[PDB]
């Protein structure tokens, strides 16, 4: 059942945490190096960040130092967030479900 | 800065698992309830799945049996894939970091 889904999910997280790394970096850069922050946003315009690898591939050709920073940042981000994810997602679902099904229930009366 | 990014990630996960739960149920229903299967596909075309709570609320008006199955299944799928996601994602990030760092090294020789 699961391993098929769990894999697809993991790919999705891989791309998403990359996007988050870029955001994190984009924000620091908007303060520290406006020129770079603008460049990075212009790049994200010409390149669909969801294809995380094609994205990083292209950038390697244009700006080696930045993609090197993305690679590090996303790993650290990953480590720091992946710890508490199982529990959060599980309880949030259990809540949402509870809400939705009692929502439906009074929504009848 | 982890705790905020984690919350945003948990929210997109909850939403993605809802998309899977629906992919899963649609597949099953293909055999046992050909009608519902099609209906389920059609509905997703006129209410974006990406907006998971709005999606569910909309469906309570049209088919209660199905929305109640989508709730149960996504939680089941959740328990199934969640604990095995930290180890899986962290691995693939390490891997991808490697491949990129490497074909950079290849480039500048």
From Swiss-Prot, chains A, B:
Q: What is the effect of changing residue 32 to A?
A: Assembles about 50% RbcL8
Q: What is its main location?
A: other
Specify whether Cytoplasm is a keyword of the entry. yes
Key word Cytoplasm present in the record?
Answer: yes
Summarize the impact of residue 73 to A: Assembles about 50% RbcL8
Domain of life per record:
Bacteria
Q: Where in the cell is it found?
A: Carboxysome; Cytoplasm
> What Gene Ontology cellular-component terms does the record carry?
carboxysome; cytoplasm
Biological-process GO terms, alphabetical: carbon fixation; photosynthesis; ribulose bisphosphate carboxylase complex assembly
Keywords in alphabetical order: Bacterial microcompartment, Carbon dioxide fixation, Carboxysome, Chaperone, Cytoplasm, Photosynthesis
A GO molecular-function annotation: protein folding chaperone
Quaternary state and interactors: Homodimer (RbcX2). Interacts with the exposed C-terminal peptide of RbcL ('Glu-459-Asp-468'); binds 2 RbcL peptides per RbcX2, stapling them into an RbcL2 dimer. A slightly longer peptide binds with a higher affinity, but no long-term stable interaction with RbcL is detected. Contacts a second RbcL monomer via its peripheral polar surface.
Similarity comment text for this entry: Belongs to the RbcX family.
Q: What does this protein do?
A: An RbcL-specific chaperone. Required for assembly of the RbcL8 core, acting downstream of the major chaperonin (GroEL-GroES). Acts on newly folded RbcL, has a transient dynamic interaction with RbcL and is eventually displaced by RbcS. The central cleft of the RbcX homodimer (RbcX2) binds the C-terminus of an RbcL monomer, stabilizing the C-terminus and probably preventing its reassociation with chaperonin GroEL-ES. At the same time the peripheral region of RbcX2 binds a second RbcL monomer, bridging the RbcL homodimers in the correct orientation.
Entry note about domains? The homodimer has 2 functional domains, a central cleft essential for production of soluble RbcL in which the RbcL peptide binds, and a polar surface which plays a role in correct RbcL subunit arrangement.
Protein name in UniProt: RuBisCO chaperone RbcX
Entire-sequence positions represented here: 2 to 110 of 134
